[PDB]
Nucleic acid binder design. Structure first.
Ligand SMILES: Nc1nc2c(ncn2[C@@H]2O[C@H](COP(=O)(O)OP(=O)(O)NP(=O)(O)O)[C@@H](O)[C@H]2O)c(=O)[nH]1
Ligand SMILES: [Mg+2]
Ligand SMILES: [Zn+2]
Lengths: 50, 311, 113
RNA sequence: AUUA
């Protein structure tokens, strides 16, 4: 209830799209990888950016 | 003797005019093309047979043919004066092809010709007809159009199911290469409508009077009115062209910074959801003379027909 | 060939004003069309210089609509009379094709300047 | 367009 409040107050009338709430306030991320070629382009190493 | 080699250098203008006849002498050329007709006894959108035209392809420095044609036609004397007057009124628009009126004798009599310069081989109606009446048994026009504009190469069609949408979904990427041409044609159409309104000319716009570069011609069915009170009729044009606007994705350039295909994308904030003004700006930019009220939000519509129209 | 209404249309008669009930007797060459479902006028011409209103009578008589007009345009005509000036109007909401129809017919059947 |  702090990140959600922080992004709600920035809205000009209190309404925000639902598709950007997990994108900016979620704490955990889950990735499903088909094969190794896709793996080495998305989550290579120990830290990645998304 | 003379004639063919004198008509050639009379059609040959004053700019560079490296011309070559399209297998003719002084006679006309016959082709099979698509038109949009309404003349009180016939109507429809079909493929008729053109009869009165002589075409000269243009060359360049290394003597290899290019996509530029000089189309000269002969007709009566009254249409000559009418078209000359309308063109003189409309000649300053940058979206109007360059006409050239001269007189030449084929016999003891003298007949008038009208010559248009630097057109393409196919018009917009040909593309619309090819895409809206698809038949894989004979699609030569579509293949020619695709290969003459660097959408693909001639060996792309050696594949089978190259046209299918479920198999080979790469045909979408192949088709999406004409969107910029379509968008430039739309902009030139808006320019032409503005010029017609300012000059005081009344006429109906069809797809077969515009080539694939956007230029306009054929002012044979127009009339004259007081300046500032012109009115173009653009119902059939937009209505028939509409299904092609999404197949080729003509509005892709509107997601870039300066409507330029070489700059990065626009970065909207994630909290914006209205976009009610961008829709109006797009409508005013591409559909200015479509005369029917447009509601960005379908909650203000009057009935189900208006809902369909705005959706 | 895409022509703008070969078979033409017929007629022009009746009235006009500037503030609702200002239409007294007849101040309009209210032009054209008697459609197949009933009389539906298209174009309005005014020997006067400023009008915003009109009242065309039809069928029942009790049903005669107080039409809202639009800002006018002006031109001079090549009539045998000589100097003759009106101020052109169209009924509001008239789509482009109808204005093209009436303008083409007026210009190509009768002489104007 | 087959009205040239
Ligand atoms: N762009 C282009 N069109 C051609 C060519 N050769 C034939 N055409 C066809 O022939 C027509 C020639 O132009 P024009 O006759 O002025 O146009 P139109 O629509 O037939 N009207 P009109 O018969 O009143 O002159 C075009 O409409 C087009 O469909 C060509 O080399 N380039
Ligand atoms: Mg023609
Ligand atoms: Zn609506």
């Amino acid at each position: 209830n702090d990140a959600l409040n922080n992004i709600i107050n920035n809205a000009r009338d209190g309404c925000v799209p639902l598709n950007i709430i997990p994108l900016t306030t979620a704490a955990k991320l889950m990735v499903v990888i088909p094969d190794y070629n896709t793996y080495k382009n998305t989550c290579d190493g120990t830290t990645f950016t998304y | 003797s003379a004639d063919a080699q004198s008509f050639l250098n009379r059609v040959c203008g004053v700019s560079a005019a490296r011309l070559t006849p399209c297998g003719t002498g002084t006679s006309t050329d016959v082709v099979y093309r698509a038109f949009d007709i309404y003349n009180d006894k016939v109507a429809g959108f079909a493929k008729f047979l053109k009869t009165n035209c002589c075409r000269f392809q243009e060359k360049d420095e290394d003597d290899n043919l290019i996509d530029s044609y000089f189309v000269v036609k002969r007709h009566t004397f009254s249409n000559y004066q009418h078209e000359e007057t309308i063109y003189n009124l409309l000649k300053d628009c940058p979206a109007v092809a360059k006409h050239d009126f001269f007189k030449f004798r084929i016999d003891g009599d003298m007949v008038p010709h009208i010559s248009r310069q630097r057109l393409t081989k196919y018009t917009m109606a040909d593309l619309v007809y090819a895409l809206r009446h698809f038949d894989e048994g004979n699609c030569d026009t579509l293949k020619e159009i695709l290969v003459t504009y660097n959408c693909c190469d001639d060996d792309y069609f050696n594949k089978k199911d190259w046209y299918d949408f479920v198999e080979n979904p790469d045909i979408l990427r192949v088709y999406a290469n004409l969107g910029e041409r379509v968008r430039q044609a739309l902009l030139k159409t808006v320019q032409f409508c503005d010029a017609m309104r300012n000059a005081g000319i009344v006429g109906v716009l069809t797809l077969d009077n515009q080539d694939l570069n956007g230029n306009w011609y054929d002012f044979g069915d127009f009339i004259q009115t007081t300046p500032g009170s012109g009115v173009p009729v653009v119902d059939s044009y937009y209505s028939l062209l509409m299904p092609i606007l999404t197949l080729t994705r003509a509005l892709t350039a509107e997601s870039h910074v300066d409507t330029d295909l070489t700059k990065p994308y626009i970065k909207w904030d994630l909290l914006k959801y209205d976009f009610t003004e961008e829709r109006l700006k797009l409508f005013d930019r591409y559909f200015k003379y479509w005369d029917q009220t447009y509601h960005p939000n379908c909650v203000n519509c009057l009935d189900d027909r208006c809902i369909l129209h705005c959706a | 060939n895409n022509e703008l209404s070969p078979v033409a249309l017929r007629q022009m008669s009746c009235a006009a004003g500037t503030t609702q009930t200002a239409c007294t007797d007849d101040n309009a060459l209210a032009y054209y069309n008697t459609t197949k479902g009933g009389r539906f006028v298209l174009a309005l011409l005014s020997d006067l210089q400023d009008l915003k209103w009109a009242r065309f009578p039809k069928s029942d008589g009790t049903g005669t609509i107080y039409t809202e007009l639009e800002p006018p345009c002006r031109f001079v005509t090549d009539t045998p009379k000589g100097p003759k000036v009106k101020y052109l109007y169209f009924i509001k909401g008239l789509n482009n094709l109808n204005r093209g129809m009436v303008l083409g017919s007026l210009a190509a059947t009768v002489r104007l300047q």
